[PDB]
Design a protein around this ligand. Structure first.
Ligand SMILES: [Cu+2]
Length: 124
């Protein structure tokens, strides 16, 4: 299954957002992060990727397709707008084993507000 996440300057949740900001996919599914607005990328957040997965970082303005392999919760950010809260969460598969350690990861205040909302949106 293929899903799309749009990178926008402004959306329903305020400035600098990924829409949707919370998504659940199956192990092996692909998500394309689309630069609807220019000046954004996607990068995994330190401490917010499961065991066996590798970190990734796309280039500014590229349409970036990612096939999620390792099951778990992945926190993603937009590099330049991380301090402004441009973040999202991708849950891969059921019963993520790192969900509890992703909740304790440290992020700038605006990003933490949005991550907490996104994490609660998946059933915590
Ligand atoms: Cu951005």
């Amino acid at each position: 299954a293929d899903f799309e996440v749009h990178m926008l300057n402004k959306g329903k949740d305020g400035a600098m957002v990924f829409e949707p900001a919370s998504l659940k996919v199956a192990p092996g599914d692909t998500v394309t992060f689309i630069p609807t607005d220019k000046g954004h990328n996607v990068e995994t957040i330190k401490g917010m990727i499961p065991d066996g997965a590798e970190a990734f970082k796309s280039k500014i303005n590229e349409n970036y397709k990612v096939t999620f392999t390792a099951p778990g919760v992945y926190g993603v950010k937009c590099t330049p707008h991380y301090g402004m809260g441009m973040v999202g969460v991708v849950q891969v598969g059921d019963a993520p084993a790192n969900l509890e350690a992703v909740k304790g990861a440290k992020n700038p205040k605006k990003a933490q507000e949005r991550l907490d909302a996104a994490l609660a949106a998946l059933g915590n």
